[model samples]
Every structure is written in structure tokens, then in C-alpha cells.
Target: MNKELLQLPLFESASRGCLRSLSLIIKTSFCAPGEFLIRQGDALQAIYFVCSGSMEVLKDNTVLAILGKGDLIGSDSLTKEQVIKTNANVKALTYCDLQYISLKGLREVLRLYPEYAQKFVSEIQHDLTYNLREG
Candidate 1:
């Protein structure tokens, strides 16, 4: 399970120590079909990684995207200094198993393993660029 965390783009470049620390703070959760993982305007305090199943992304009740295994949610919050509110709703399209790290937990790990901070930022940049092109 700890090795799986390193597979994520955000942590792909992280050191073993960093991965170990993250594993201590990361949590697992499950969401049933039609259940909301996040709601629009909600403060996003954690980053969620899909382990299996699918979720539907919505903005103003319109479908924006379908998130599947290995996809991430609430990652944009990492780029901001202030509290970030979700702009879209994320609801489970099928039974979902997710792993998440709260911003606080992430910060704690980064403080001890600062070298990997830039890697996370770079990954987010890539995701943002991809999203912009798709949008």
C-alpha cells in the first residue's frame, strides 16, 4: 500500500522517507454510488486519490468529467495560500475506494521532507496545463 502512494504523480519523485511519513497520515475511505465525495463551494482541506471505481465531476449541475482509478481531486488547493473552496461537485458514479491526505498531514510531511515540495508543485503544474488544454 505504501508503494502505491509513490505511483501517484504528486508523490512519484518523493523519497522513501517521505513515502513512509505519508503512509502514516494517509487514510482510506469508501463512497457508494450516487454519494457525494465533495460538494461545490465546500472548503477543500484534503487531496483525494481514486484507488478504484469512478466519480462524476459537475459544475452547476452539468457534467464536466469522469474521474477513474488513479485520478486526483482537490489537488488544486495545494497551489493556493488561502483556504480553497471546491468549484465543482464530485459524486461517486460507482462504488469507490479512495485514499486521501489532509492538507495538514501533507504539510507535516513536507516540513520534514522539504526537498520533495517542488516535485509536488511541478506535478500540479502539469495537471493544470493539461486541464487548461482540455478545457
Candidate 2:
């Protein structure tokens, strides 16, 4: 475990438990401030983790939330539902550190980390069920 990884519980939990399945989990930086990390209508192939800096979650051009280090983004998209109804903008409010985890790869990792895996799967399922009822 690296220094930074050891420092953050979320990062450590994800890394220790389920990161091995990832073919590549690279640390990406955005030099340009106020950039879109994940845009609307993207494939939602990966999940986003904020390693540093602040980011804004925008829906329909309105800022819904501000997320910083230790926060995770694009959870809805990462669900891999048949119909992804919630598409939002992930903008880096400042120069950001983003970690992208592929959904396909993550499915395998979940097997090893049953705790987080169960929780995450349940959350996704709850959201889907709620959306279905609402729709």
C-alpha cells in the first residue's frame, strides 16, 4: 500500500478489496481547471473516484452537488442498467485527480469484496426499483 492509499479509507478499501480485477487503474490528472471529467451521454463504462480536488455534479446544466477528495461520482451511470435514465455532468471544479474503474472488470473484483460489493449492488438495485416505480 502506498502512502496516499494508506491515508484514505475509501481508496484503501477499494484498492485492497477489489482493485486487482482492473486491467489498468491509472491516476489521471486534469491540468485545466473546470473541465468535464464525465460528460452527458457517455457510455458510463467506468466509475469515477475523486482522489483530490473538487468537482461539481450537474444535471441539466444545474449544479446538484460539489464533491471533493474521497467522494465517488458517476454511480448512477456505473450501474449498467438497460436504460440509464440519470445522465449528469461531472465537472472538475478545480484541477482534479480521477480514478476510473471499468464495470466489466469491477464485476470480478466484487466477488472478492463481498461487503462493498453487496452494498453497492443493493444500492444500484434499490435505485433501479425506485426508478421503475416512479416511471
Per candidate, the number of residue pairs that clash is: 0, 0
Q: Pick the candidate with the highest lDDT.
A: 1
Where in model 2 is the C-alpha error above 4 Å?
Answer: 1-18, 23-31, 76-86, 111-135
For candidate 2, the per-residue lDDT at 11 reads 28
Instruction: Report the poorest 10 consecutive residues by lDDT, candidate 1.
Output: 126-135
Q: Write candidate 2's Cα lDDT for 12-128 as tens digits.
A: 457543545443443344523778765565555555555677777567658766667756554453334344423565567888776655555555566566677656555443322
RMSD (CA, Å), candidate 1 to true, equals: 4.3
TM-score of candidate 1 on Cα atoms, chains taken together: 0.74
- Candidate 2: residue 17 Cα off by (Å): 9.0
TM-score of each model, paired residue for residue: 0.74, 0.58
- Give lDDT tens digits, candidate 1, residues 39-103: 66777666666768888767766866667776766545355545666667767898888777787
